[PDB]
């Protein structure tokens, strides 16, 4: 029985019937809007012996809705940073670039000038580092001592000062332990953007001592340890 | 009786398969 | 000489009973004529299980 | 937790008889394949599993195939004492021999027999759950051993891939000889052994004859003595899988510690307390004395002198009553000697293993009974000298094409001689180059 | 005829990798400057916002 | 408040046999039907699953249906088989042939009227009727076709009650039959329209439960059916015994389903541990809750870690403090907060019942509504698309009479179900 | 304040077996797990290392991991092996092959999720968690690779707790394996970033302890692991018994580590003396103080006479006066001023605990932070440079997949650690 018949045969008043039917219609429309997978269709050049038949076989046959509310709270804590926004995780870190440059210099047995960049974050960090160095020692830092800017992670304080994060935290969820235990998705000690790491499927292996895993190409084929390891490459975000 | 014979056969099968070695290569 | 078990540190002294306790040993079959140093793997590999 | 043995031709089957005699007597399987066990589930061992599987009737059967082109030796196995031990399918025999021709084995005759062997090996590998390598026994001097051994190693290397293949090989002795055409077959064999083996142990009968005359008191030795020595060595190397010990050594640890570069895989083997009963009365057998013994060239089972080269790695297997502190003191004393030299790029030259099971005594044997033993396998540049004597004999015969018409008529291009001889020249140069001290900026 | 090549050739005695890489720095001064610029952190829970402060 | 159970096909009949063993044990009913129990608490709700016939005996309100009588003779031969009313066994004379169209259209319509007559006779006898409970496999032939036919007819006749199904669906890894994707797709199409709440079980997940958690040496289908019978009998426990915070199937549905298509749930049961290990760890509410959310203890191949929980429910059995239940469920909600849908402020319902399952002092059953169920349907749809593009076996179904348009409709409906789950699974920072 | 133990590889599992023997003896726990002690002081802190299982039993909060099960059957077969929870044994099938890359990348990633699941199971059960304690060798294969992998994961998940390692490093004199330098170099690179405090032991130093001090005729690896288990159980004694001046792992770290990379420490345990000599000398605070600083009693090959002490700590167990402790530490500090780094005005922390180990009147454990540890790493780097210049065994690691640049990273990081220690050694006030 369809929903329309049940609604028309029910004991509700007219207004509730209209509200229920409109809700169902809006849900259907929003379902239509969504990204989807295309419905499969049979191929055109399909061979013979698929439309043919057999005498015995022939004898056998009988023939908008979801409004968005983002409430804001006065005096909420800052949860973003410019230095954090500039960096990305898929690329090489600054320390890795420094090692690559040092490796090239050692291989070529001569000093190689470093590339000059017009990033404002580098300029701000260098100014803060020069001020700190001048406070600690009367001299200004040299070019060799200014290479320390690449090896450090920088951030803004709440009042606008520039500092260095001594001990960065994991960009995924982690623990801060006190009189009580708590999970923080984001914390000011993090250097990169917060993200949820991918995990391996728990039911990847066969239910037994035999060495059978699920294939990396599709969701149904199987594989074993012949010439490759299928258990190490089953990590996925979803 | 059919029920008695079926129960007896099932019981003897359970007695046989209790040993893993016999289940494997008896 | 073909059947006697040689006297070892790991078998201990047979005529006094002293035996040092060392790592690397496994449970022993009590059948006659079998070496006590044969490997035992029932705890970690339940044979013929499925 | 298991290894499969492949025996090829006459030497390989005869050495197999001694090996399986020893492994049966050491584990306790009777000649008909029976072994009593415990009646309560959970109180039982597994050490046999490396070499035997049991049937549902309780017979034991071994993880081996015997391959030959002539019937006589396999029929001798079929009619002997161990008739009931082997499965009859495992004993495979052809109609006629490869007549000392590598070409006949490789192209004409082994090509017919090879698919049955591969089907049997597949049937074995399906009845395993932790296979960790193949052991192969053959001689490179004869026709079927060289040709079919090479063809089978090539096919195994394609089908099984990464699985390890360790060979024990009887190479042609430097002046004792049995057939005229030995150099051609050994040269053509070594190319395949070069490509398709992970570690290769080299043996010469002349060294084991010298060892049985000098250390043992045997005036008239025969092949059964040599085969019993080989069986003892193999039992020592595989004991680490089968019995409790202080420092175990898995077969992958051998390859990791012993092989510096992927072509440099030919190793020397020696065994320490080879001694007669009379000597046992007058000789102490401490750890350091047998460790000193394993370094004498009189102890080696291949006719090469390691003082003419440099060691790259040594693997020392101790079984019996040994304490790690005594092994350490012995190795430090060896390291102190100036007649023992390691390449300067290999400072930490040694691998040790310690197993509690002492070596077994065989009823007809000639070795004394001893409470402890040590066995060594080592990689050294001196082996390059061993190949040169075979290559000189090849050049002597090939200068006049002395026998080549047999090989060309039976299906082989003349070009294969020059290719193989150039490959052995390059292998000699590799062992010369790897062994050269230090370097320079210019 | 088999013509496969499974094992790579051995290296020359003169072929050497890049090695002995060292960074040069004054660790005392660098550590002092890093300690000067360090930002404070706390493991206690952040003060919670009241329900009335909603916009 | 009376439940009527329906068991269809071989898998359904076997699970039903194990379920009625467990239920007869909990209420102390002898296999002759005589009450032999030892507390009044057993009698006061016996009506929920048993009807009373005269002079003591009780008979269970269940209909047995199958297309070939082999299973019925097996259940009659089982240890509790005598309890069942003879008139309640309905069977045909030829098998489903593993074909959905055969099970649904030709042999289905011949028998279905006698099944509806028996179900109506059983329903109208209750003083107040609670929902129906149905066990069947989706990969089979008579299970899928006649189960979904009967579900549609009962939903037409009793639209105000609850319709609940437990369903087993074919593994991609451990299948018994080649034509499984067609039968699965058509059955999921029928269920998403017809069902009120549907639970899905993979035999692979029960095997992994048995092998990893229970360390069984030689498992059999009886063990698998015991795990299923344990969860099914646990869900109804608050219906039929006293407790500090009562719960009901309708109350579960109201708290679990945010929108009417999103009614497919995961199941788990916490106190599972091998006889050798049990001496090393005592049972406690933190331990049950931790196992309860551990994916090792969940009965489907899809993993929760790839999705997010919209809602969940936990039913506790045993004598325990309410403070520990409340604070544990709060702690689990706080500690795994990224896996919970953020536009619902608290996702978990709790319930507490005084009377545990026999031989355990305490137990909990877990019902979870998680978007990772989309991975199972996608996998079945993939195998269908491989088979359908090539017309791999369609002539059987077309010879029975099916339009290919039925196949395209069922594919489209499942694809829309997958899309609806997929939008809610992933975060949207904007 | 609960500690979680991790035992990795053959060396780690054996040392762990001896440690849990020592701890079970000190708290009077029978090998069946039953409490049989004779004072409430034993019972009142049993929670620190044991969890309580039902009806009497106690279970030890430890995870055992290894790549080949050979060791696990041996530990289960040992005299105390039964106490361990069966589910806490994690093992693979194929060996580490003495290869760091294999242990880290191929079988490491296969097992690591199950070890993290067990570690999380153990950590989340504590009411308040103190640091982790890990025993492993750096020269091995699964010990080095999986130990440093697990350390990295636990350091990601618990960055505010303490991370403690006990580590065995290859002797320059008596190696058991050829490829020791690679595994050691890569592991020290991982440790210097990840660890908060790391203790290093040379087997050569334990042999010299046994032969010269204890005059043992036939020492075995059990004796070396007994010495290590003694110090390990000694460091935590003030956590779990009363005393006149309490101390804690965090308080040790705060007083010992001036800068976060300088966290590598020397170990000693004082009351060691042969059975023939024992009739000749009574225990007293001067005797313990003289032995604790004697280089004969220190568990590393580097000797203090080539370096300087930045900081040191002494924990005393027994009923003794505080005046003698204070005056001994003052006299040694005033009399020995050249062996102490001069820009710190007082280098020694003392602590006093009331409860000695059973059958000893008094004991002290000594932890020292001395720059002479740089000599060990330089020596390991020498053996590495000898092997690496010639690419001696590199194809195994490259076949697993490593880029040669990893080796240059590990060399650079070890060289920087040696440079930082050398620079702080030669610093001056000016
Ligand atoms: N040590 C040892 N050497 C043997 C043994 N049998 C044969 N040899 C040696 O191996 C070489 C002969 O190789 P064979 O095994 O006879 O050659 P084949 O495999 O039979 O090849 P075909 O003659 O073509 O059948 C000679 O150098 C023999 O001295 C043996 O039992 N022990
Ligand atoms: N868990 C469980 N699965 C079963 C049982 N019997 C059959 N199956 C599974 O169900 C599928 C076969 O479906 P089936 O019940 O035969 O369909 P039917 O012929 O319509 O009843 C296969 O995957 C079987 O493994 C059972 O008793 N328990
Ligand atoms: N002190 C001590 N050292 C050990 C013990 N067992 C092994 N070793 C040493 O550790 C090194 C071998 O490492 P191993 O533990 O086997 O590495 P793994 O294979 O990764 O577990 C060698 O130097 C051994 O001497 C032990 O019980 N105590
Ligand atoms: Mg022959």
């Amino acid at each position: 029985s369809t929903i329309y018949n049940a609604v028309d045969a029910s004991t509700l008043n007219d207004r509730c019937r209209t509200d229920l039917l409109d809700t169902v219609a809006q849900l259907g429309r929003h379902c239509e809007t969504l990204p989807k997978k295309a419905v499969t269709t049979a191929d055109a050049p399909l061979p013979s012996c698929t439309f043919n038949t057999t005498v015995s076989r022939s004898q056998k046959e009988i023939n908008t809705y979801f409004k968005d509310h983002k409430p804001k709270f006065h005096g909420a804590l800052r949860t973003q940073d410019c230095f954090r926004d500039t960096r990305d995780i898929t690329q090489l870190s600054s320390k890795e670039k420094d090692f690559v440059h040092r490796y090239a210099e050692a291989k070529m047995k001569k000093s190689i000038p470093r590339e000059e960049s017009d990033d404002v974050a580098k300029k701000v960090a260098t100014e803060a580092y020069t001020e700190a160095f001048r406070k600690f020692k009367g001299r200004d830092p040299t070019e060799k001592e200014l290479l320390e800017v690449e090896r450090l992670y920088f951030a803004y304080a709440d009042d606008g000062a520039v500092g260095v994060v001594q001990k960065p935290h994991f960009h995924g969820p982690h623990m801060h332990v006190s009189i009580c235990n708590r999970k923080y998705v984001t914390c000011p000690n993090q250097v990169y953007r917060a993200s949820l790491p991918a995990v391996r499927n728990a039911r990847s292996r066969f239910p037994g001592p035999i060495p059978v895993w699920t294939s990396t190409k599709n969701l149904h084929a199987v594989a074993s340890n012949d010439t490759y390891r299928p258990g190490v490459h089953n990590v996925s975000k979803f | 009786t059919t029920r008695e014979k079926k129960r007896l056969f099932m019981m003897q099968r359970a007695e046989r398969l209790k040993d893993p070695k016999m289940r494997h290569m008896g | 000489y073909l059947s006697d078990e040689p006297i070892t540190l790991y078998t201990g002294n047979p005529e006094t009973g002293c035996t040092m306790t060392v790592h690397g040993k496994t449970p022993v079959e009590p059948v006659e004529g079998r070496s006590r140093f044969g490997r035992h793997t029932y705890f970690t590999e339940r044979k013929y299980c499925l | 937790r298991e290894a499969i043995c492949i025996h090829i031709g006459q030497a390989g089957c005869q050495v197999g008889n001694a090996c399986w005699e020893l492994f049966c007597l050491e584990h306790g399987i009777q000649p008909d394949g029976a072994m009593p066990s415990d009646k309560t589930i959970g109180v039982e061992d597994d050490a046999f599993n490396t070499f035997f599987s049991e049937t549902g009737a309780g017979k034991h059967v071994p993880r081996a195939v015997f391959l030959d082109l002539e019937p006589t030796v396999v029929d001798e196995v079929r009619t002997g004492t161990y008739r009931q031990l082997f499965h009859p399918e495992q004993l495979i025999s052809g109609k006629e021999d490869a007549a000392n021709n590598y070409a006949r084995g490789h192209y004409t005759i082994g090509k017919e027999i090879v698919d049955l062997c591969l089907d049997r090996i597949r049937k074995l590998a399906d009845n395993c759950t932790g296979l960790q390598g193949f052991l192969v026994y053959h001689a490179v001097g004869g026709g079927t051993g060289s040709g079919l051994g090479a063809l089978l190693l090539e096919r195994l290397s394609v089908d099984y891939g990464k699985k390890s293949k360790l060979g024990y090989t009887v190479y042609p002795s430097p002046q004792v000889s049995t057939a005229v055409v030995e150099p051609y077959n050994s040269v053509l064999s070594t190319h395949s052994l070069l490509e398709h083996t992970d570690v290769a142990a080299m043996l010469d009968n002349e060294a084991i004859y010298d060892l049985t005359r000098r250390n043992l008191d045997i005036e008239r030795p025969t092949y059964t003595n040599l085969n019993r020595l080989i069986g003892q060595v193999v039992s020592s190397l595989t004991a680490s899988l089968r019995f409790d010990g202080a420092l175990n050594v898995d077969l992958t640890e051998f390859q990791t510690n012993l092989v510096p570069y992927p072509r440099i895989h030919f190793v020397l083997t020696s065994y320490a307390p080879v001694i007669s009963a009379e000597k046992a009365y007058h000789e102490q057998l401490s750890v350091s004395e047998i460790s000193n013994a394993v370094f004498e060239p009189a102890s080696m089972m291949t006719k090469c002198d390691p003082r003419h080269g440099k060691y790259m790695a040594c693997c020392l297997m101790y079984r019996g009553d040994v304490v790690p502190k005594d092994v350490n003191a012995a190795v430090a004393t060896i390291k102190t000697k100036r007649t023992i030299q390691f390449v300067d790029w290999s400072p930490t030259g040694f691998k040790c293993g310690i197993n509690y099971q002492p070596p077994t005594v065989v009823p007809g044997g000639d070795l004394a009974k001893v409470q402890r033993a040590v066995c060594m396998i080592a990689n050294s540049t001196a082996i390059a000298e061993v190949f040169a004597r075979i290559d000189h004999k090849f050049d002597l015969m090939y200068s006049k094409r002395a026998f080549v018409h047999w090989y060309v008529g039976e299906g082989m291009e003349e070009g294969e001689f020059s290719e193989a001889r150039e490959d052995l020249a390059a292998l000699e140069k590799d062992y010369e180059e790897v062994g050269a001290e230090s370097a320079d900026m210019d | 005829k088999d013509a496969s090549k499974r094992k790579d050739d051995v290296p020359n005695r003169y072929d050497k990798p890049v090695m002995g890489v060292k960074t040069e720095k004054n660790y005392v001064v660098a550590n002092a400057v890093e300690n000067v610029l360090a930002l404070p952190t706390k493991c206690i829970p952040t003060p919670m916002n009241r329900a009335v402060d909603r916009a | 408040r009376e439940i009527v159970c329906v068991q269809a096909g071989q898998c359904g009949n076997q699970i039903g046999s194990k379920f009625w063993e467990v239920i007869s044990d909990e209420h102390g009913v002898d296999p002759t039907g005589t009450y032999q129990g030892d507390s009044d608490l057993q009698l006061e709700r016996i009506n929920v699953y048993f009807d009373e016939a005269t002079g003591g005996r009780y008979v269970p309100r269940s209909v047995l249906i199958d297309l070939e009588p082999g299973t019925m003779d097996s259940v009659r031969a089982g240890p509790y088989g005598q309890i069942f009313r003879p008139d309640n066994f309905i069977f045909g004379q030829s098998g489903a042939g593993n074909n959905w169209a055969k099970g649904h259209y030709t042999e289905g319509a011949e028998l279905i009227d006698s099944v509806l007559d028996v179900c109506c006779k059983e329903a109208e006898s209750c003083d107040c009727l609670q929902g129906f409970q149905i066990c069947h496999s989706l990969g089979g032939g008579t299970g899928s076709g006649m189960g979904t036919l009967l579900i549609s007819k009962l939903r037409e006749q009793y639209p105000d009650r609850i319709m609940m199904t437990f369903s087993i669906i074919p593994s991609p890894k451990v299948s018994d039959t080649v034509v499984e994707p067609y039968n699965t797709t058509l059955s999921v199409h029928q269920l998403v329209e017809n069902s009120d709440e549907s639970m899905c079980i993979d035999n692979e997940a029960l095997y992994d439960i048995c092998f990893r958690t229970l360390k069984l040496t030689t498992p059999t289908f009886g063990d698998l059916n015991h795990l299923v019978s344990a969860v099914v009998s646990g869900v109804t426990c608050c219906l039929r015994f006293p407790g500090q915070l009562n719960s009901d199937l309708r109350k579960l549905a109201v708290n679990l389903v945010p929108f009417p298509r999103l009614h497919f749930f995961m199941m788990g049961f916490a106190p599972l541990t091998s006889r050798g290990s049990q001496q090393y760890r005592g049972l406690s509410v933190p331990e049950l809750t931790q196992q309860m959310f551990d994916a090792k203890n969940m009965m489907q191949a899809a993993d929760p870690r790839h999705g997010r929980y919209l809602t969940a429910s936990a039913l506790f059995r045993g004598r325990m403090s309410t403070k520990e239940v409340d604070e544990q469920m709060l702690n689990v909600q706080n500690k795994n907060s990224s896996y919970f849908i953020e536009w619902i402020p608290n996702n978990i319902k709790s319930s507490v019942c005084d009377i545990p399952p026999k031989g355990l002092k305490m137990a909990v059953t877990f019902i979870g509504n998680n978007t990772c169920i989309q991975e199972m349907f996608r996998r079945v749809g993939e195998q269908f698309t491989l088979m359908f593009r090539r017309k791999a076996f369609l002539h059987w179904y077309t010879g029975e009479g099916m339009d290919e348009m039925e196949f395209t409709e069922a594919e489209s409906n499942m694809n829309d179900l997958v899309s609806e789950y997929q939008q809610y699974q992933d975060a949207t920072i904007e």
Side-chain angles (χ1 to χ4, degrees), chain F residues 8-12 14-15 66 96 98 137 139-144 168 170 174-176 180 203 206-207 221 224-225 228:
Chain F
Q10 46 262 22
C11 180
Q14 288 261 289
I15 291 171
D66 198 345
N98 290 132
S137 68
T142 182
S144 314
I168 308 102
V174 177
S175 62
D176 300 331
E180 277 163 12
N203 279 301
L206 304 182
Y207 295 141
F221 264 112
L224 283 179
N225 297 352
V228 179

Side-chain angles (χ1 to χ4, degrees), chain F residues 198-241:
Chain F
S198 295
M199 283 135 278
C200 318
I201 297 95
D202 290 343
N203 279 301
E204 182 177 356
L206 304 182
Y207 295 141
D208 285 331
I209 285 165
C210 295
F211 185 72
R212 304 231 287 280
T213 81
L214 299 184
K215 302 252 211 188
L216 301 181
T217 187
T218 306
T220 307
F221 264 112
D223 299 18
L224 283 179
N225 297 352
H226 192 66
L227 291 173
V228 179
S229 300
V231 176
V232 65
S233 62
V235 178
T236 309
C237 71
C238 282
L239 197 62
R240 71 185 191 277
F241 284 123

Side-chain angles (χ1 to χ4, degrees), chain D residues 51-366:
Chain D
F51 288 141
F52 302 86
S53 59
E54 66 201 13
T55 289
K59 183 180 289 290
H60 298 279
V61 285
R63 292 179 146 116
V65 298
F66 283 61
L67 315 180
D68 207 319
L69 262 56
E70 62 197 310
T72 303
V73 182
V74 185
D75 280 352
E76 182 175 1
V77 182
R78 290 176 182 133
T79 187
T81 186
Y82 300 108
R83 313 189 294 280
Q84 299 286 303
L85 186 64
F86 300 104
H87 187 312
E89 302 305 5
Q90 287 168 10
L91 304 184
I92 311 184
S93 173
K95 294 287 180 68
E96 295 181 354
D97 60 358
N100 288 140
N101 276 321
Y102 157 91
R104 188 170 167 84
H106 205 120
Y107 300 106
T108 61
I109 302 299
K111 190 64 172 67
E112 306 195 274
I113 211 168
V114 71
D115 283 23
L116 276 68
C117 307
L118 287 167
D119 190 359
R120 298 326 281 191
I121 297 164
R122 185 51 74 171
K123 288 177 177 293
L124 296 179
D126 285 348
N127 192 359
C128 291
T129 57
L131 175 66
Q132 63 176 227
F134 297 93
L135 306 184
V136 188
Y137 295 166
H138 65 120
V140 299
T144 191
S146 58
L148 184 58
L151 179 61
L152 184 61
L153 286 169
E154 298 175 23
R155 300 289 293 251
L156 256 58
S157 189
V158 173
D159 283 348
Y160 291 106
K162 192 170 66 185
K163 288 278 141 63
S164 62
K165 295 164 304 308
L166 287 72
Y168 297 96
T169 67
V170 181
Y171 184 75
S173 167
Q175 65 175 346
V176 171
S177 175
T178 297
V180 182
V181 302
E182 287 164 2
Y184 289 6
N185 299 334
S186 53
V187 169
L188 295 165
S189 86
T190 196
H191 189 50
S192 86
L193 287 178
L194 175 67
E195 305 146 9
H196 300 283
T197 286
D198 296 331
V199 181
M202 309 265 298
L203 304 167
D204 305 343
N205 290 345
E206 192 188 10
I208 315 179
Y209 288 139
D210 286 344
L211 182 64
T212 50
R213 186 178 178 81
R214 198 195 96 81
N215 280 336
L216 295 162
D217 275 11
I218 299 163
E219 292 179 349
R220 294 181 180 81
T222 318
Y223 291 138
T224 58
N225 305 98
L226 284 67
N227 296 352
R228 286 185 170 138
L229 267 62
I230 295 166
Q232 291 286 356
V233 175
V234 179
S235 84
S236 189
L237 195 162
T238 320
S240 192
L241 306 188
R242 297 178 295 137
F243 298 101
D244 297 349
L247 293 172
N248 290 319
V249 182
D250 170 9
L251 298 188
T252 60
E253 303 187 37
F254 265 95
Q255 309 192 31
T256 303
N257 285 276
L258 196 59
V259 179
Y261 307 101
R263 286 166 65 211
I264 309 297
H265 66 60
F266 299 88
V267 300
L268 313 176
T269 69
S270 65
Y271 195 87
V274 297
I275 62 167
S276 176
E278 316 181 3
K279 296 180 173 304
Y281 266 127
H282 307 66
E283 291 170 358
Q284 64 279 302
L285 305 93
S286 71
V287 174
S288 61
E289 187 201 319
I290 68 176
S291 301
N292 283 358
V294 167
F295 289 91
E296 295 293 328
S299 304
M300 307 265 278
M301 298 195 190
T302 181
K303 184 59 70 80
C304 187
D305 185 308
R307 295 177 293 182
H308 293 238
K310 299 172 193 340
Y311 289 102
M312 295 168 197
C314 294
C315 181
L316 286 164
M317 315 280 268
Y318 293 85
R319 76 185 294 195
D321 288 5
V322 305
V323 187
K325 65 182 182 69
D326 281 348
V327 174
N328 296 343
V331 172
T333 305
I334 295 297
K335 255 174 156 178
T336 302
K337 305 301 178 56
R338 235 290 305 241
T339 62
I340 298 299
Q341 300 180 20
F342 284 83
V343 295
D344 74 356
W345 58 260
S346 188
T348 183
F350 290 87
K351 169 63 167 175
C352 297
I354 298 180
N355 195 269
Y356 300 139
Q357 182 68 285
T360 191
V361 185
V362 178
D366 57 3

Side-chain angles (χ1 to χ4, degrees), chain A residues 84 89 153 165-177 184-194, chain E residues 41-43:
Chain A
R84 184 178 294 171
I89 192 63
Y153 287 138
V165 176
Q166 293 294 109
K167 221 176 164 73
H169 277 185
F170 190 41
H171 63 84
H174 54 284
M175 211 65 98
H176 298 171
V177 178
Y184 293 100
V185 180
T186 181
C187 73
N189 276 280
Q190 289 179 334
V191 164
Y192 299 98
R193 195 82 42 63
Chain E
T41 180
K42 284 181 280 323
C43 80

